[PDB]
Amino acid sequence: KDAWEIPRESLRLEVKLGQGCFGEVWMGTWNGTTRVAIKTLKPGTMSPEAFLQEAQVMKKLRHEKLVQLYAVVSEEPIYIVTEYMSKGSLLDFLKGEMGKYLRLPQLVDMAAQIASGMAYVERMNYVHRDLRAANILVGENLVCKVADFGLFPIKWTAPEAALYGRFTIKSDVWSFGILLTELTTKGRVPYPGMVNREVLDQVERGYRMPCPPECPESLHDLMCQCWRKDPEERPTFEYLQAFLEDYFTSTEPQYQPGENL
Numbered sequence: 001k002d003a004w005e006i007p008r009e010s011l012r013l014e015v016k017l018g019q020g021c022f023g024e025v026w027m028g029t030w031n032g033t034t035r036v037a038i039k040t041l042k043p044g045t046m047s048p049e050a051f052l053q054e055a056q057v058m059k060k061l062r063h064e065k066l067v068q069l070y071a072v073v074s075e076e077p078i079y080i081v082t083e084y085m086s087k088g089s090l091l092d093f094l095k096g097e098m099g100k101y102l103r104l105p106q107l108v109d110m111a112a113q114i115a116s117g118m119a120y121v122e123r124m125n126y127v128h129r130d131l132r133a134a135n136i137l138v139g140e141n142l143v144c145k146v147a148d149f150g151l152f153p154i155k156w157t158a159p160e161a162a163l164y165g166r167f168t169i170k171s172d173v174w175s176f177g178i179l180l181t182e183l184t185t186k187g188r189v190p191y192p193g194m195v196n197r198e199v200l201d202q203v204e205r206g207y208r209m210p211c212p213p214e215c216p217e218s219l220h221d222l223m224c225q226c227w228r229k230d231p232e233e234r235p236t237f238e239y240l241q242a243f244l245e246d247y248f249t250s251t252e253p254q255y256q257p258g259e260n261l
């Protein structure tokens with residue numbers, strides 16, 4: 001009883017892309033013609049009402065840089081159907097064969113797209129809560145879109161959120177600064193060689209990751225703005241998006257390619 005509802009026979013599940021405690025992610029086909037991604041809910045693993053709230057949120061969000069809901073099968077077994085992003089998660093994309101060809105212009109453009117999606121989240125007064133490369137999807141032509149797979153990522157979380165539960169758009173901005181290090185290191189785990197307990201105490205003392213090799217200091221300066229201790233002093237996503245879009249003209253006009261960035 002909804003315009004999003006589709007018949008069960010119009011959806012075909014072709015390849016299992018992921019497993020979870022609550023369900024699976026598949027690639028499949030909708031209406032025989034449209035390639036789609038599909039989230040399933042294991043019967044009895046979580047409240048159907050609880051699972052379907054995801055779909056209710058996605059019905060209200062529509063932006064070119066956010067993975068787009070296409071369809072729902074809303075009675076058990078429940079299915080949530082979205083557009084398909086052919087290159088998979090940004091984390092895997094960076095770690096895999098393509099990583100060797102990505103240089104700073106592609107990585108900054110990817111960051112600018114993610115910032116645009118998060119600027120929409122910001123305009124709509126939502127909060128992501130788990131922004132990191134594992135929750136970004138990549139398509140043809142290096143298109144990047146914000147997603148949420150419901151995946152503790154202390155290393156990506158702002159200290160006021162990790163310590164006190166203060167999750168806001170500004171703690172997402174912190175996470176975006178961490179995501180900038182994942183881009184510029186081709187997907188490495190942040191704070192290399194530190195465990196969670198060291199990270200939280202180190203960051204509280206004022207430690208911040210140093211500038212990654214071959215990364216311009218001006219982009220590390222941007223990371224450090226995202227990691228300001230006071231959340232209201234961090235930049236908006238609107239600002240981050242504009243900075244990254246304009247980066248190679250306004251900020252690094254004499255960038256030259258290196259071996260890795």
Ligand SMILES: Cc1ccc(C(=O)Nc2ccc(CN3CCN(C)CC3)c(C(F)(F)F)c2)cc1C#Cc1cnc2cccnn12
Pocket residue numbers: 017025037038039054057058061066067080081082083084085086087088089126127128129137146147148149
């Ligand atoms: C099937 C599916 C279902 C749902 C979602 C999904 O991301 N839902 C989502 C739910 C909430 C929010 C925002 N809230 C976050 C929390 N926050 C507290 C409130 C706001 C957002 C967001 F994108 F806006 F962030 C997204 C993605 C997929 C996929 C897929 C897929 C597509 N191509 C490929 C290729 C390879 C592997 N997977 N894959």
